[PDB]
Amino acid sequence: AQNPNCNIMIFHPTKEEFNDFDKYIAYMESQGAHRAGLAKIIPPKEWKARETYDNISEILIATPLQQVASGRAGVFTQYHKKKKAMTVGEYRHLANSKKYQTPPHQNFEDLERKYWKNRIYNSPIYGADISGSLFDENTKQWNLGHLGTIQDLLEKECGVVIEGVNTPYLYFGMWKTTFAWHTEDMDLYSINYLHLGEPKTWYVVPPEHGQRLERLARELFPGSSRGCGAFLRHKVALISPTVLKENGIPFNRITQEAGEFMVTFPYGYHAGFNHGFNCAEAINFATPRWIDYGKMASQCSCGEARVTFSMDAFVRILQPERYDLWKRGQD
Ligand SMILES: O=C(O)CNC(=O)C(=O)O
Ligand SMILES: [Mg+2]
Ligand code: NI
Ligand SMILES: [Zn+2]
C-alpha cells in the first residue's frame, strides 16, 4: 500500500505531465497521495497563471466577512459578521494597516505559534467565496475555470444527465483569516491555487481517520453536536494542532506559497489560516473514485449549512433516501 503513514506529498510535474489534469490526479493517487487528504503541486517553471496581477484592485468584495471568535485559544468557533462592500484595493490597504497586518516574526513556525496563541483576540476580515477567476483565458494547463464539470463526471460514470454548473471562487485573505475544519460539499475534491501574496497554512486529517476528528469535535462542541449530526458542515469550528495531538488525532500540516496548487481529496478534513494579504482561487471537482464518497457523504439537514444550487442534483441522485429531509433543511 503506497504512503501508509498518510504523509502530505509534494509533486513537481514537468510541462508534459501538466497537460492532462485527470491523468495527473490519477498518477498522484497511484503514489498514495490521497491517503494524506491533501497534496501540494508545484507547477513546472515554464508555466504561468496569468501575465501580471497589476490589474486586480478593481474587483469588488461585495460582502466582506469579519470573523469573530468565541471559546478558548485552541478550541473555538467563529461567526461571520457581514461588512460593507469594498474593492480589492481597499481590502489590501486594510490588510496592510497597523490593526490587521502580519506581526513581526522569525519564520512560519513562529507565526503559527502566534496564530494559535492570539487568533481569538482579533476579528480579521475575509473576502470569501467570490464567483470569478484570475486565470488568463490563454492558460491552457491547470486553469481552474476550464476543468471538466462535476455534472459531466456524474453523467459519464452513472449515465444520468443533471442540471447545475460548477465555477471557481476567489478568496482574498489577510493575517489570521481562518478556514474552519470541514470536508468539501458532498465530500468532493477541491483544488486551490494561491495566486499572489502571503502564504496559507493548512492542517489535514487522513480520510481514513476522518471519523476520529468527528468524534472529537462532538466532544469539544457538545451543544453544536446536539443541534446537528453533521455540524462540521457549518464550517465554524476550530481545533488547534496542540489539541489534536493531546487527543491522539492523526493529522499533518503544510504551508502553501504563492504559485502553488493544493488538492484536497474526498473526505479529507482540512482547516487553516492566511499569513497576510493574499488571493486564492478554488473549485471543487470529481473523479470516478469520488462517486463512492459522494454516496456516503454526511449531510446537514438542520438548516445552517445552506449550499449551492448544484448540490441538489448530487443529493437527489446519489442519496435519494436522504433527499427529502436534506431539501427540507434547504427550504
Ligand atoms: O482557501 C480557503 O480559505 C479555504 N479553501 C479550502 O477549504 C479549499 O480550497 O478547499
Ligand atoms: Mg481590477
Ligand atoms: Ni475546503
Ligand atoms: Zn446542520
For 253, which DSSP code?
Answer: E
Sequence ranges of the binding site for 2-oxoglutarate:
126, 192, 200, 235
CB 179 less than 6 A from any atom of ligand 1 = yes
Nearest-atom index, ligand 1, CA of 126: 3
Integer Cα distance of 170 and 175 in angstroms: 17
Q: Ligand 1 pocket: which of 41, 182, 190 to mutate (most atoms <8 Å of CB)? A: 190
Integer Cα distance of 253 and 251 in angstroms: 7
Q: Which three cell numbers stand for residue 105?
A: 516574526
φ, ψ at 55 (rounded to 5°): -115, 40
Count of domains in the chain? 1
Q: Ligand 1 pocket: which of 179, 235, 254, 285 to mutate (most atoms <8 Å of CB)? A: 179
DSSP 107-157: SHHHHHHHHHHHGGG---EEEEEEE---S-TT--SS-TTSSPPHHHHHHHH
Distance from the CA of 48 to the center of ligand 2, in angstroms?
19
CB 238 within 8 A of CB 70: no
> Cα separations (Å) of 11 from 4, 29, 43?
17, 11, 8
Integer Cα distance of 50 and 136 in angstroms: 5
The CATH number that applies at residue 129 is 2.60.120.650
Q: Which residue has the cell 465555477?
A: 167
Integer Cα distance of 148 and 110 in angstroms: 40
The sign of the CA dihedral 42, 47, 50, 52 is positive
Q: Which three cell numbers stand for residue 144?
A: 481552474
In terms of Cα–Cα distance, which of 215, 193, 188 is closest to 143? 193
List the domain range (segments joined by +) for residue 258. 1-331
Integer Cα distance of 22 and 292 in angstroms: 18
Sequence ranges of the binding site for Fe cation:
182, 184, 270
- Strands ordered across the beta sheet of 237-239: 9-11, 38-41, 261-264, 189-197, 278-285, 169-173, 125-131, 65-72, 75-82, 237-239
CB 171 less than 6 A from any atom of ligand 1 = yes
Burial of 102 (0-12, 13-18, 19+ CB in 10 A): middle
Integer Cα distance of 5 and 294 in angstroms: 25
Distance from the CA of 133 to the center of ligand 2, in angstroms?
12
Give the list of residues 6+ apart from residue 67 with CB closer than 8 angstroms, or none.
78, 79, 80, 81, 123, 124, 125, 126, 176, 177, 178
State this model's resolution in angstroms: 1.7
Helices (H) and strands (E) in the chain, counts: 10, 16
Integer Cα distance of 21 and 14 in angstroms: 12
3-state DSSP call for residue 186? helix
3-state DSSP call for residue 278? strand
φ, ψ at 85 (rounded to 5°): -50, 145
The protein residue with its alpha carbon nearest to ligand 1, atom 3, reads 179
Give the list of residues 6+ apart from residue 287 with CB closer than 8 angstroms, or none.
22, 25, 26, 153, 189
CB 174 less than 6 A from any atom of ligand 1 = no
Distance from the CA of 59 to the center of ligand 2, in angstroms?
5
Integer Cα distance of 121 and 114 in angstroms: 11
Integer Cα distance of 175 and 272 in angstroms: 11
Nearest-atom index, ligand 1, CA of 182: 7
